[PDB]
């Protein structure tokens, strides 16, 4: 009761937000944000400790991360380690945590009815944790699993490298993840007891004065106040001074430096970094966001436009980057063409030229006003968040903003400060520049190796003559400030719900040219709409060449429209356009206001598109590398790719695609585009703040624009063919084996093909997947330690389904095969032995997952789109299937497992894909497995088997 | 020596390549005989040709000679049983047939070589003691009426009788030869005429041995055949009947300079030009009509056709002499018409007269005659061995026109050049002697006459003297020039020695990403010929209706542009076919191997460097549209078979989709399509004949090099070489697809009982059941129940799958045909239960012999090899393997198979029916009990049918 230091004033929110908020500070120093939502399906809480990796002891790298994993392992009130995860498993909840350089954030979600139970378990870890020594080894192996995952990832390698080139005395040079070496091998050699140092670090840094708690639930602000006071007033205050790092990790000796790095994928990137002071205090004016907007701009007269026109880069990322408290960065990152890689000095000269233009022309208030106005719209009409991510995020921002500004934080801009823009800009100079070039052209040309990832690199001082040239940069007439953004929305009217509005999408047009699904939004009432279009053409996937031409076409289309579309994206109007195995997919999402102008520009450009030869050659080269770079993808990704090729009627391989790519000449592409658009079928979904008439008007405008400019005619119904799944023989087992040449981990996908999708077959598979879900993770991952990726669940494709297992392990594929099979028998027992109460808990847990209500329009549109892309159109599926699921018995599941999934099942349809590790050679009792039929040639495999029928669509 | 033999002919001129032995003789009763000894023959044959036909019919019964044809072979005093000859032949792998023309009635049969005497004895009995079973009178009248009812709906038969109806009505040429229900029943009954008594009067008046000719072919020696024929045909009664002669031409002055406007059934635009001529038969050693037909009907540069095509009036032309009867003949010039041609008939005829007058001005050419003589000399020498049945029937006719020694050289050898005779014939080709007939639907409603026998709507007009004058006065036209020396005439007839590494079946001698080459050097016929087959694969030939139309148009324009050059090769026995398929293009080059690489090079170069002429493109595009619409006028059984292929194949474009897409085929789109089609290909070839391994490899490389060079051809990926699958029918399912034929008033049906994928066992289970039911299906459904004119049964094979099919065309509704077929399968189930092991082994043996039956010419062997290649099974030794398995089969194996797959209540029944309704139709009697049939699932949309079903795998290859 007197355990509250203060209660904040009104928590500034959007008028559209019905959730009720209350900010307060407990006597111990804990900053609190309470969120009352009587409608919420799930309740949630989050605690963020303002201590992270940058505070790790130098002798124990990754200790903050280690403590994150250890803290939630038993308490005095709840001594069992399983208690927290078990309680959330039993009440449709989840939990997760993350460690950054200055924060350790713990969070969970649970069924709205069980907030007190869940929060009670959570709070105890912050009162009397036990840090159980039984799980010490397994948590160390978990931390090591995470680091080993990131070792071959080019982004994590670059992330650590930057840290290695700065001041080695600075906490910024620290390795924050940790691994087996830093948490076991080195402490043991050095005579460090990990447990006493863990306990030590905890005692010194885990103080309430550095903690922020966020609670979201059905309960009122008052009941939420009472609960948070009850469970968090006991958090010990040690009055810890919040760590600051005001010295920049890049001093004079770390500047005017050039780095030459070797990547894993065939990627070519340039990274330009300027050390800057911490700009967080100026958040109400945000001069870094201001400069980020201009330097990063993609509209006409932009730095990017000229860099692209010069044929040097394709993409650009610019602006402020976080460091820690006391130090930040201003970055200008570009990818490089083959010509760009030879014109790095020229690229950086253009970057400095652009910076100089902003200096000569000075700050612009109209630009800042535009940013302010866009941010206000974006905040006002922000989509509703899933509570788990909402609490976690707020727990962090509580440490940086007054209680009342916690929601507006990342949005509201106020005073224009030209003084600060001038200040930040004055730091963007050649004397302060850091350059990093990433390219395979440096293989065998480097002398240094980064210890944690093995990254190969060289370091050079940039010559004074180069710095002088960049300092002396002329003024370029190609660079001009962006003009006023005509995509800024103004019409925010929510259209009244029509008399004839429907709960699900309805077919409001069914012609030879198009099938139109429409639903006026009756849930979110934000001034937005989602416009999904599926274009069908037999010429988009007829052969590898055409598949490449479909891809090149849309990539060049997007490239040409970019300068125009960028203003729309800044204004909350975005689109996606990609080729499919059937034609093209187009999606326009955001504010409905200017939506038809963007859409009409896109349909027009599709049909009157004139290709720039220089861009075509550059996009073709980037696509060749992209096809090659798949070799550097994870072995499980490879295993899942090989199974889609094997099981789909028609599927062109990356090898066939890259082989036909050389035959894509410009005259062939120019000929392809009219041929592709000559005959189409359009299937659309228009969902949102729109009427039935407006929907018809949109569809009609897309047809009319194509008919006018491309002379489009409808396709024949007989031409609208969908690919079938390969029908496996009863009691058959096939294996397809390949090698991953990059990763030293194995990849596997095991598919037990069941049958064609139907209400009954769907829920047999979904309930069996629900039953074995937690156990497969506990047995195969927790107990057996097979690998970081242990996945099980239903697999659905082309109207067909089955059960799959996906594993990425150090162990061989044939071994994982016997382990999965061992588990299948272990579950045969576990189902016969479980109680009816336990069985009914699985049915309830599935029904809850299946009825999870979308929190935003996009999530609902995606669910409707799923029904459309599969041609099933079962919009009421969830309700029907849940109702059917509740009528299932334990016997039904036993009958099904016996007929389809058991080792001795009469209708067993097994197909495995084995992806060997880079260096790889070519417990419960595992059952006797037959000799597999090995697949040498995919064409012959496919030819030798029947093809399933295609699922019959659900009709009104 | 023999008193029954009037005279034995001298040496029968034969080909030096022919191993068969020949003997000509005349019996004392006047019968002219040819005996053919062939110890090699699998089937023996005999034919009798009576020099009496339709032209001799009495006025009271039109079609009597033809009715006699049917009645004569129904019982004899020695073999009273009506169906003896039929059953005997059927029991010994034989067959029989007959035809009645205006001057001949020809009866023929074939049988297993071990049963010539048995078959010949029953055959001879019809010319000694016929009975004409009064019980089979009505069924014969119905058979004659069904035959005419089929002809009524045919454009060529209509024109045939209409030509006869526009001559002198008083001349026997105007007679209706077929007969029908009216002439054989309706009319004689209304007049008290005794059909039988009048039939017998005719037979007793005209059937005389001095007007008869007999050919016997067997494994027996010439001497044994001599004794056999003397024994069986010397007792045939001689009534010394005089040979009917027709010296007066049926076309007299009043039938000349006449114009006819005719309405056809199909949307066809044709022009027929005719001139009466004396009978030229007796000039056969010089053949002036052949010489003139060769020049008038020429298609090489300077030809009449070339100029009619350039003017855009016609696409095709046929020209030459046409048989009439003893005493009269016709000279014809027939062309089809473009839309413009139909408007320029007067000009087309002027051009025809210009070419004629040019021949007159140029005068006969000895060198032209020499080429024809030399070509015919090559043709006779290197002639393919004829099928025995057709061979005897042909000679039986020819025996009436030529001395015994010349019956084989008859229609081949040219001796003396007679420029005077050429001149005599050309003198009759003048505008004052012309007859002109235009056939077009543009005349519908614009006519006033009706030819009553067929119902043909026509109009007759005299040709203005004004028009005749223009034709008579036609200016000289320089576009008409005589053909030049035919450089394609073969000279190298060397049979290359059989290579040391020669194989009995084709061998894969080239296996690349671009091409699969199957090759076999001929080791049986040793004739200087070769067959070159190429299947060019492309996913763009059938990707959609448009591309399918473009592949069609492409190859039609290409055959049209190569035609002038190709025609000389065709005359020199070097022919080619080029067609689009559902997988790409098919090319076959057949004939004398000599100049073969030259023609092949020209076809491939032209394919790769094709320059389309806009005028031709529009004409061919217009012809194709009509060809697509003309499918509506095809018979209902043809429609039923087409609909089933649409339904059962993974991908298939309908005639309506093809014609909907045709208007989009522009000249720029077709020009873009060709390099696209040829850009990526796979070539699968079969080269079989008088060629070596080196020569075969050189041919394929030349084809590849030509495509690579001019079309920049690259290979297709093995994953792109996808074949279409058959639809997999559900166990115990019955599906029905129904449509209507808007032209014919007869139903069409195809019933398909899908079994399973082709395999040694499945194939022979189906082929033995098909063997067992084959004859009974005909005798029951066609002969006894009179279901229809068309009754067919046998295995169906498509996309590696098989089943049992029934194809029937009837006047009765499709659902009634369904019950009769179903009752018949019950009769067949009972029949197999009841049949003796003896009768069962006879079925195994009849099938085994049929399957092991050796090909008699190179093309028949290559076709067998091509069948294995196109199906991608490549099982060239199949017959030996399948016959060996078939022989192990028991009666129980077939009952088990019938019970599981075909029975009405079979657990794995897979029935699909196509019902084609008649034009005007809408939807005990001591007969077999039809079973309880379920309600069929009516297919409304073909796409939904295919989507809702699995697709079978494809058969695994042998190689
Ligand atoms: C944090 O991880 C890393 O640091 N990894 C390494 C570094 C490169 C690095 C650098 N010097 C090195 C010297 C030596 C040795 C190694 C080095 C390594 C690296 C950096 C990044 C950058 C990550 C930080 C992202 C923070 C951020 C910064 C700018 C933006 N703007 C925009 O989004 C702007 C936008 C314009 C409107 C106003 C607000 C900003 N933006 C929008 C999208 C497109 C547009 N062109 C644009 O612009 C966004 C995020 C990504 C990969 C990478 F490997
Ligand atoms: C016997 O059948 C018929 O008679 N049917 C009727 C008529 C139409 C008709 C005609 N006048 C009519 C007046 C008034 C009212 C109605 C009429 C109706 C008709 C005739 C035919 C012709 C049938 C007889 C066939 C005899 C024949 C004649 C010439 C040839 N040459 C060639 O094949 C020549 C060949 C060149 C080398 C030397 C030998 C001749 N030939 C080769 C192929 C192509 C080339 N252009 C060529 O040329 C062939 C057969 C075809 C259809 C048709 F409806
Ligand atoms: Zn971790
Ligand atoms: Zn007949």
From Swiss-Prot, chain A:
ATP binds at residues 386, 852-858. Its main location: cytoplasm. Keywords: Allosteric enzyme, ATP-binding, Cell membrane, Cytoplasm, Host cell receptor for virus entry, Host-virus interaction, Hydrolase, Membrane, Metal-binding, Metalloprotease, Nucleotide-binding, Protease, Receptor, Secreted, Zinc. It catalyses: Degradation of insulin, glucagon and other polypeptides. No action on proteins. GO terms for biological process: amyloid-beta clearance; amyloid-beta clearance by cellular catabolic process; amyloid-beta metabolic process; antigen processing and presentation of endogenous peptide antigen via MHC class I; bradykinin catabolic process; hormone catabolic process; insulin catabolic process; insulin metabolic process. The N-terminus is blocked. It is found in: Cytoplasm, Cytosol; Cell membrane; Secreted. It comes from the Eukaryota. GO terms for cellular component: basolateral plasma membrane; cell surface; cytoplasm; cytosol; cytosolic proteasome complex; external side of plasma membrane; extracellular exosome; extracellular space. The active site is at 68 (proton acceptor). The keyword rRNA processing does not apply. Binds 1 zinc ion per subunit. Substrate binds at residues 293-299, 316-320. Zn(2+) binds at residues 65, 69, 146. The keyword Membrane applies. A motif (SlyX motif) lies at residues 810-815. Detected in brain and in cerebrospinal fluid (at protein level). Disulfide bonds: none annotated. Its cofactor is Zn(2+). Changing residue 856 to C: Increases catalytic rate towards INS and amyloid. PANTHER family: INSULIN-DEGRADING ENZYME-RELATED, NARDILYSIN. Plays a role in the cellular breakdown of insulin, APP peptides, IAPP peptides, natriuretic peptides, glucagon, bradykinin, kallidin, and other peptides, and thereby plays a role in intercellular peptide signaling. Substrate binding induces important conformation changes, making it possible to bind and degrade larger substrates, such as insulin. Contributes to the regulation of peptide hormone signaling cascades and regulation of blood glucose homeostasis via its role in the degradation of insulin, glucagon and IAPP. ATP-binding induces a conformation change. Homodimer. Can also form homotetramers. This is Insulin-degrading enzyme. The gene is IDE.
Swiss-Prot record, chain B:
The gene is IDE. Its cofactor is Zn(2+). Changing residue 786 to C: Increases catalytic rate towards INS and amyloid. Binds 1 zinc ion per subunit. Pfam families: Peptidase_M16 (PF00675), Peptidase_M16_C (PF05193), Peptidase_M16_M (PF16187), PqqF-like_C_4 (PF22456). ATP-binding induces a conformation change. It is found in: Cytoplasm, Cytosol; Cell membrane; Secreted. One of its GO terms (cellular component) is extracellular exosome. Its EC number is 3.4.24.56. Gene3D superfamilies: Metalloenzyme, LuxS/M16 peptidase-like (3.30.830.10). The SlyX motif may be involved in the non-conventional secretion of the protein. This is Insulin-degrading enzyme. Changing residue 789 to F: No effect on catalytic activity. Changing residue 244 to G: Reduced enzyme activity. The modification N6-succinyllysine is found at residues 150, 655. Changing residue 384 to C: Increases catalytic rate towards INS and amyloid.
């Amino acid at each position: 009761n007197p355990a509250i230091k203060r209660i904040g004033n009104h928590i500034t929110k959007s008028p559209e937000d019905k959730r009720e908020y209350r900010g307060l500070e407990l006597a111990n120093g804990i900053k609190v944000l309470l969120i009352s939502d009587p409608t919420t399906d799930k309740s949630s809480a989050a605690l963020d400790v303002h201590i992270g990796s940058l505070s790790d002891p130098p002798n124990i790298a990754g200790l903050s991360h280690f403590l994150q994993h250890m803290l939630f392992l038993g308490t005095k009130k709840y001594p069992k380690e399983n208690e927290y995860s078990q309680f959330l498993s039993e009440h449709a909840g989840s939990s997760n945590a993350f460690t950054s350089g200055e924060h350790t954030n713990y969070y969970f979600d649970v069924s709205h009815e069980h907030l007190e139970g869940a929060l009670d378990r959570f709070a105890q870890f912050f009162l009397s944790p036990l840090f159980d020594e039984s799980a010490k080894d397994r948590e160390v192996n978990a931390v090591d699993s995470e680091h080993e995952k990131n070792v071959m990832n080019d982004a994590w390698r670059l992330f650590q490298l930057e840290k290695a080139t700065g001041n080695p005395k600075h906490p910024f040079s620290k390795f924050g993840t940790g691994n087996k070496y830093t948490l076991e091998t080195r402490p043991n050699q050095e005579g460090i007891d990990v447990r006493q140092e863990l306990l030590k670090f905890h005692s010194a840094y885990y103080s309430s004065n550095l903690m922020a708690v966020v609670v979201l639930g059905r309960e009122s602000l008052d009941d939420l106040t009472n609960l948070v006071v009850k469970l968090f007033s006991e958090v010990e205050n040690k009055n810890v001074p919040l760590p600051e790092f005001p010295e920049h990790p890049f001093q004079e000796e770390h500047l005017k430096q050039l780095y030459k790095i070797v990547p894993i994928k065939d990627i070519r990137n340039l990274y330009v970094t300027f050390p800057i002071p911490d700009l967080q205090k100026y958040y109400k004016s945000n001069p870094g966001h201001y400069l980020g907007h201009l330097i990063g701009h993609e509209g006409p007269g932009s730095l990017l436009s000229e860099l692209k026109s010069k044929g040097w880069v394709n993409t650009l990322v610019g602006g402020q980057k976080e460091g820690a408290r006391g130090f930040m960065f201003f970055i200008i990152n570009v990818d490089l063409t083959e010509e760009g890689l030879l014109h790095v000095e020229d690229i950086i000269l253009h970057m400095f030229q652009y910076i100089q233009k902003l200096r000569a022309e000075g700050p612009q208030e109209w630009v800042f006003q535009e940013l302010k106005d866009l941010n206000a719209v974006a905040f006002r009409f922000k989509d509703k968040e899933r509570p788990r991510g909402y609490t976690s995020k707020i727990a962090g921002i509580l440490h940086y903003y007054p209680l009342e500004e916690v929601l507006t934080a990342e949005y509201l801009l106020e005073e224009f400060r030209p003084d600060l823009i001038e200040m930040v800009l004055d730091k963007l100079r050649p004397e302060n520049v850091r350059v990093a070039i990433v390219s395979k052209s440096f293989e065998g040309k480097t002398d240094r190796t980064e210890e944690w990832y093995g990254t190969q690199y060289k370091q050079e001082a940039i010559p004074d003559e180069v710095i002088k040239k960049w300092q002396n940069a002329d003024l370029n007439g190609k660079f001009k400030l962006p003009t006023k953004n005509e995509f800024i929305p103004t019409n925010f009217e929510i259209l009244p719900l029509e008399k004839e509005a429907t709960p699900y999408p309805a077919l409001i047009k069914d012609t030879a040219m198009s099938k139109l699904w429409f639903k006026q939004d009756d849930k979110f009432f934000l001034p937005k709409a989602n416009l999904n279009f599926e274009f069908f053409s037999p010429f988009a996937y007829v052969d590898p060449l055409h598949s490449n031409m479909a891809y090149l076409y849309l990539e060049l289309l997007k490239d040409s429209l970019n300068e125009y579309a960028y203003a729309a994206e800044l204004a909350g109007l975005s689109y996606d356009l990609q080729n499919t195995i059937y034609g093209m997919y187009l999606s326009v999402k955001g504010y409905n206001d200017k939506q038809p102008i963007l859409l009409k520009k896109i349909i027009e450009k599709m049909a009157t598109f004139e290709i720039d030869e220089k861009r075509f050659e550059i996009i073709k080269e980037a696509y060749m590398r992209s096809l090659n770079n798949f070799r550097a993808e994870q072995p499980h990704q490879h295993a899942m790719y090989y199974l889609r090729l094997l099981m789909t009627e028609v599927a062109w391989t990356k090898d066939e695609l890259k082989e036909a790519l050389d035959d894509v000449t410009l005259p062939r592409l120019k000929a392809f585009i009219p041929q592709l658009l000559s005959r189409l079928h359009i299937e659309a979904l228009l969902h949102g703040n729109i009427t039935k008439q407006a929907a018809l008007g949109i569809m009609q405008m897309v047809e009319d624009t194509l008919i006018e400019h491309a002379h489009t005619k409808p396709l024949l119904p007989s031409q609208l063919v969908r690919y079938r799944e390969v029908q496996l023989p009863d009691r058959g087992w096939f294996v397809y084996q390949q090698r991953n040449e990059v990763h030293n981990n194995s990849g596997i996908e095991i598919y037990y093909q069941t049958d064609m999708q139907s209400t009954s077959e769907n829920m047999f598979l979904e309930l069996f997947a629900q039953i074995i879900s937690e156990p497969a993770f506990n047995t195969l991952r927790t107990k057996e330690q097979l690998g970081y990726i242990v996945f099980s669940g239903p697999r659905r494709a082309n109207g067909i389904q089955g059960l799959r297992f996906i594993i990425q392990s150090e162990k061989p594929p044939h071994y994982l095969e016997s382990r999965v099979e061992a588990f299948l028998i272990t579950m045969e027992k576990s189902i016969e032995d479980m109680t009816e109460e336990a069985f009914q808990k699985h049915i309830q847990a599935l029904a809850i997952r299946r009825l999870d209500k979308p929190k935003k329009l996009s999530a609902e549109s995606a669910k409707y789109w799923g029904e459309i892309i599969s041609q099933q159109y079962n919009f009421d599926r969830d309700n029907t299937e849940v109702a059917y699921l509740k009528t299932l018995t334990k016997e039904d599941i036993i009958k099904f497992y016996k007929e389809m999934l058991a080792v001795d099942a009469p209708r067993r349809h097994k197909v495995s894909v084995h992806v060997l590790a880079r260096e790889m050679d070519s417990l419960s009792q595992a059952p006797a497995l037959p000799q597999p039929e090995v697949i040498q040639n995919m064409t012959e495999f496919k030819r030798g088997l029947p093809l399933f029928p295609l699922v019959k669509p659900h009709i009104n």
